[PDB]
Structures are given as C-alpha cells and as structure tokens.
C-alpha cells in the first residue's frame, strides 16, 4: 500500500515520545516523501 507502515510507525514513534510530534517529524518527513511517491 502507500504508507500505512509509516502511519503506524508515526503512531509508534509518537506513543514512545508521549505524542511529542517533534521527535517523530523525521518519520512524518518519510510519510510526506512516501505520499509524494505513492
């Protein structure tokens, strides 16, 4: 599929970082780049 792994790993990352998106923005960059591909 497009990026469901990235979405799951973004959730996982946020969960592990108390929803501090800033620690998982590198993974959101990956999701954005993924989305731009797919």
From Swiss-Prot:
It is found in: Mitochondrion. Residues 1-38 form the CHCH domain. A motif (Cx9C motif 2) lies at residues 24-34. GO terms for cellular component: mitochondrial intermembrane space; mitochondrion. Expressed in many tissues with a relatively high level in skeletal muscle. The keyword Protein biosynthesis does not apply. A motif (Cx9C motif 1) lies at residues 3-13. Disulfide bonds join 3-34, 13-24. Its main location: mitochondrion. Keywords: Chromosomal rearrangement, Disulfide bond, Mitochondrion, Proto-oncogene. The twin Cx9C motifs are involved in the recognition by the mitochondrial disulfide relay system. Belongs to the CMC4 family. It is linked to Overexpressed in T-cell leukemia bearing a t(X;14) translocation. This is Cx9C motif-containing protein 4. The lineage of its organism: Eukaryota, Metazoa, Chordata, Craniata, Vertebrata. The gene is CMC4.
């Amino acid at each position: 599929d497009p990026c469901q792994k990235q979405a799951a790993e973004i959730q996982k990352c946020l969960q592990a970082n108390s929803y501090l998106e800033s620690k998982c923005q590198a993974v959101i960059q990956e999701l954005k780049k993924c989305a731009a591909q797919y």
